[PDB]
């Protein structure tokens, strides 16, 4: 995205677009609620037999 | 993910947190989830011997 | 044993709860890990370094 | 009290900081029971049994 | 690291999401529907776009 | 101990005839997010207005039907009618009709108007006709309400299952198209942790943006009158 | 104390010699903020002397790294004490266990880009309960010497300074104990004999 | 078409520090618009009283000890800044404490005053472990809102204060926990109305109804910049 925006339009639209991407990424990452727990690490049930 | 629809079940990509941040390119790789949830593997001596 | 003790205190076994945003009052989409950690202040204060 | 990033755990493999966070909750959740029985003014047998 | 995770979570899709099937007039209406609590971010819809 | 800082509504900026920026500063710490969020939740779901709720078409009675002589499907015709802005003075229900034949665009200026119903933009295109023998006749229904109500809840919070020919439209009652805000840092001469609230407002041409801000403010301020003393 | 430990804190606390440990068993006879006095039992008693142990605590001393060393008593007046028991706590000790920090309530999630790369976001209730406040002690020195023109003197008659800036000094030329000083203030007044100058 | 308006139905007092209030009826989408505004107001802007200075006699700074008293003076200052007191008619008051003997010194030993009251009379201030020991101090209490640390008002006024007046940090706000709920109201004609329930936990020193009145008043006065524009 950033490279095609630089090739078509130029420098100043690119430096505005980069800022807007940063702001909206931070906002929606905050609203998602992503976390890490102990149950997110799932061990396959057929390892004990491969061993 | 086995999420069902208007009549019955089907499959889709997972919404697991670790998979989501590994697959998107934010932080991580497969080689490190392998050590988190798989087995660690073979270790070398300080000589270079395994 | 961790989960058995979590049940003894009437808490969620998965270790994740639902949280609300303080600025808008909405809910966060997924559950979040909340707990007690032990933190330490190190002797690298910014009054010295500036 | 404090908000930490989850993107720090997977690619560093210090999983001990997650388990500690789950155990420190279970400990605190037990105190909040005993505390209640001292506000609620229960007798010594209930505290002994719990 | 989090620009990437937020942009990736906002442009994924899901099956049987709330508000699936609607037809909207533009991006402004999709935003107004997401803020109100009527649609989901991962819902499959049809939008007119210039 | 009871005297709080009060802002000054500087710098109203008109981007277009229906688009505005409002700046409000300075405010006590944490009041930008109280004011902006309470005002945004009202402009979005409680503003009253009037809009199209259903249409009746001839021979084109089914949902997935096809009339000839028109460039487009009827599913986008039920989409060009959500962009209809009308002012209704005096009643809670008005039924309107439209019909035209020939070649060219079918706009809102071709509607048989009344003295109590006014249209805002007569350049709003509703159809296109590609044949001299082509025709269309339609009976549109204009209700009054508040907020946004979709067609799904509308169709199954109700089982007065009418004769076929009713095509349901999503009703956009509130005149507000887009509302956003953000909070920045402001500095009175020696204090630094104060706020500055900036609001971006865009409506359809029914009412001005400032009038909408004033009406939402009044709606909120009039709910607190049992406690203010 | 930590809520989750490994069982290894008691030994590191006791074996560092930073606490006051009882030498002989007995019964606490006197407690203060600055000293403890133990009345020894009869079995552990030596047949020739009074049998009274005295422990004098350390208060607000600076360490090699300008931190604060300070002891404070655990026991209360009149209770029994056995040999090897802890009587006072040192810095970073709680009832005889090593306590290096505080246990906080954490949530793992992103917040609006304020924890972007290893950053941390903190509540105001943590800075207004004084949980991570620390005391630092620092030392300064004024040395009076001989010169080829005669000795220097530590005095209060400092030339070309306003008499507001000489209020915190006593008549001997030194600041009082209990003063509140900020940058620029005078702590010890001193004058040096001066060779004659061109103009 | 006009909106219905909420009314302050009931107030239940579960304890001297914890209470519940109920506002009903509300239209659809007004339990949250009012709930979050009132929770954000009540947590930052309520006024109260706090201890602001101490003098003990024979004490020069807070890093000292006192003979016969088994706390350092920093611990006594920390025990004093957690004292909940209510003042009736003034914006400032000075209390005194004199005690002698062996035993604990608690807030029931501060000398009685006409228009000042102490909601928790068993708050522990210090201990006396000697029979010939005695303590005497005079404590200054004030009224305000917010959180003002001592390193900020020592810069307010710059003139000389005597050696021996020890400054304490002031946390003025009396409200410490707020929660709320939106439930389905019961009115006989309609079923699209809700009620709003607010749970409050305080330190004494404030009334729940008066607290809600102050919050609503602050909000209504802040909206006047919009209700009448330019």
Curated annotation (Swiss-Prot), chain A:
Protein name per its UniProtKB record: DNA-directed RNA polymerase subunit beta'
Entry's family note: Belongs to the RNA polymerase beta' chain family.
Functional description taken from the UniProt entry: DNA-dependent RNA polymerase catalyzes the transcription of DNA into RNA using the four ribonucleoside triphosphates as substrates.
Subunit organization: The RNAP catalytic core consists of 2 alpha, 1 beta, 1 beta' and 1 omega subunit. When a sigma factor is associated with the core the holoenzyme is formed, which can initiate transcription.
SS bond partners: none
Organism lineage string: Bacteria, Pseudomonadati, Pseudomonadota, Gammaproteobacteria, Enterobacterales
Residues of the full protein shown: 604 to 654 of 1407
UniProtKB/Swiss-Prot annotation, chain C:
Signal peptide start-end: none
Residues modified to N6-acetyllysine: 7
Protein family according to the UniProt entry: Belongs to the RNA polymerase beta chain family.
Reported function: DNA-dependent RNA polymerase catalyzes the transcription of DNA into RNA using the four ribonucleoside triphosphates as substrates.
The protein's assembly and partners: The RNAP catalytic core consists of 2 alpha, 1 beta, 1 beta' and 1 omega subunit. When a sigma factor is associated with the core the holoenzyme is formed, which can initiate transcription.
UniProt-recorded name of the protein: DNA-directed RNA polymerase subunit beta
Native source organism of the sequence: Escherichia coli O45:K1 (strain S88 / ExPEC)
Gene from which the chain derives: rpoB
Covered residues, full protein: 1194 to 1243 of 1342
Swiss-Prot record, chain G:
Disulphide-bonded residues: none
Primary role: DNA-dependent RNA polymerase catalyzes the transcription of DNA into RNA using the four ribonucleoside triphosphates as substrates.
UniProt record similarity statement: Belongs to the RNA polymerase beta chain family.
Subunit (UniProt): The RNAP catalytic core consists of 2 alpha, 1 beta, 1 beta' and 1 omega subunit. When a sigma factor is associated with the core the holoenzyme is formed, which can initiate transcription.
Name of protein: DNA-directed RNA polymerase subunit beta
Underlying gene: rpoB
Complete-protein stretch covered: 697 to 895 of 1342
UniProtKB/Swiss-Prot annotation, chain H:
Keyword hit for Zinc-finger: no
EC number(s) reported in the record: 2.7.7.6
Reactions mediated catalytically: RNA(n) + a ribonucleoside 5'-triphosphate = RNA(n+1) + diphosphate
One GO-annotated biological process of the protein: DNA-templated transcription
GO cellular component, one term: DNA-directed RNA polymerase complex
Main enzyme class: transferase
Superkingdom, natural source: Bacteria
Family statement drawn from the similarity comment of this UniProt entry: Belongs to the RNA polymerase alpha chain family.
Record remark: domains: The N-terminal domain is essential for RNAP assembly and basal transcription, whereas the C-terminal domain is involved in interaction with transcriptional regulators and with upstream promoter elements.
Subunit record text: Homodimer. The RNAP catalytic core consists of 2 alpha, 1 beta, 1 beta' and 1 omega subunit. When a sigma factor is associated with the core the holoenzyme is formed, which can initiate transcription.
Name of the featured protein: DNA-directed RNA polymerase subunit alpha
């Amino acid at each position: 995205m950033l490279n095609t925006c630089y090739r078509i339009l130029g420098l100043k639209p690119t430096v505005i677009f980069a800022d807007q991407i940063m702001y909206t990424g931070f906002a929606y990452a905050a609203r998602s609620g992503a976390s890490v727990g102990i149950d997110d690490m799932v061990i396959p049930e057929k390892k004990h037999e491969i061993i | 993910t086995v999420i069902n629809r208007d009549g019955q079940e089907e499959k889709q990509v997972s919404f697991n947190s670790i998979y989501m941040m590994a697959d998107s390119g934010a932080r991580g790789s497969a080689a490190q989830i392998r050590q988190l949830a798989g087995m660690r593997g073979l270790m070398a001596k300080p000589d270079g011997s395994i | 044993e961790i989960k058995e003790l979590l049940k003894l205190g009437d808490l969620p076994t998965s270790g994740q709860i639902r949280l609300y945003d303080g600025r808008t009052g909405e809910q966060f989409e997924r559950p979040v890990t909340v707990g007690y950690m032990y933190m330490l202040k190190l002797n690298h204060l910014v009054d010295d370094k500036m | 009290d404090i908000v930490l990033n989850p993107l720090g755990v997977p690619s560093r493999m210090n999983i001990g900081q997650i388990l500690e966070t789950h155990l420190g909750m279970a400990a605190k959740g037990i105190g909040d029971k005993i505390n209640a029985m001292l506000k609620q003014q229960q007798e010594v047998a209930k505290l002994r049994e719990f | 690291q989090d620009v990437v995770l937020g942009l990736y979570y906002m442009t994924r899709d899901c099956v049987n999401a709330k508000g699936e099937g609607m037809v909207l007039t533009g991006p402004k209406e999709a935003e107004r529907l997401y803020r109100s609590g009527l649609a989901s971010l991962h819902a499959r819809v049809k939008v007119r776009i210039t | 101990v009871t005297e709080f800082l009060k802002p000054r509504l500087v710098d109203i900026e008109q981007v277009s005839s229906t688009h505005a920026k409002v700046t409000l500063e300075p405010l006590e710490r944490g009041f930008g997010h109280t004011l902006g969020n309470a005002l945004r939740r009202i402009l979005l779901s409680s503003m009253p207005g009037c809009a199209v709720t259903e249409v009746e078409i001839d021979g084109v009675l089914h949902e997935y039907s096809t009339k000839e002589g028109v460039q487009e499907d009827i599913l986008e015709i039920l989409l060009n009618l959500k962009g209809l802005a009308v002012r209704v003075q005096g009643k809670d229900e008005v039924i309107l009709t439209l019909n035209k034949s020939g070649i060219g665009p079918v706009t809102a200026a071709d509607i048989t108007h009344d003295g109590d119903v006014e249209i805002v933009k007569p350049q709003h295109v509703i159809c296109h006709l590609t044949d001299e023998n082509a025709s269309i006749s339609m009976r549109i229904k204009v209700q009054r309400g508040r907020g946004y109500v979709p067609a799904s809840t509308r169709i199954h919070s109700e089982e007065d299952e009418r004769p076929i020919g009713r095509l349901l439209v999503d009703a956009c009652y509130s005149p507000v198209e887009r509302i956003a805000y953000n909070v920045e840092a402001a500095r009175v001469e020696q204090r630094t942790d104060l706020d500055k609230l900036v609001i971006e407002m865009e409506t359809n041409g029914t009412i001005d943006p400032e009038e909408a801000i004033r009406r939402a403010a009044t709606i909120l301020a009039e709910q607190l009158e049992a406690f203010v003393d | 104390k930590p809520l989750v430990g490994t069982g290894m804190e008691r030994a590191v606390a006791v074996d560092s010699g930073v606490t006051a440990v009882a030498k002989r068993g007995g019964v606490v006879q006197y407690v203060d903020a600055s000293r403890i006095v133990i009345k020894v039992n009869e079995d552990e008693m030596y047949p020739g002397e009074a049998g009274i142990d005295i422990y004098n605590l350390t208060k607000y001393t600076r360490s090699n790294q300008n931190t604060c060393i300070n002891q404070m008593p655990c026991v209360s007046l009149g209770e029994p004490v056995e040999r090897g028991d802890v009587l006072a706590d040192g810095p970073s000790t709680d009832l005889g266990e090593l306590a290096l920090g505080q246990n906080m309530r954490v949530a793992f999630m992103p917040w609006n880009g304020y924890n972007f790369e290893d950053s941390i976001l903190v509540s105001e209730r943590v800075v207004q309960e004084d949980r991570f406040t620390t005391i630092h002690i620092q030392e300064l020195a004024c040395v009076s010497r001989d010169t080829k023109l005669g000795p220097e003197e530590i005095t209060a008659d400092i030339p070309n300074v306003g008499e507001a800036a000489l209020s915190k000094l006593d008549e001997s030329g030194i600041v009082y104990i209990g003063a509140e000083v900020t940058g620029g203030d005078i702590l010890v007044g001193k004058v040096t004999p001066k060779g004659e100058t061109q103009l």
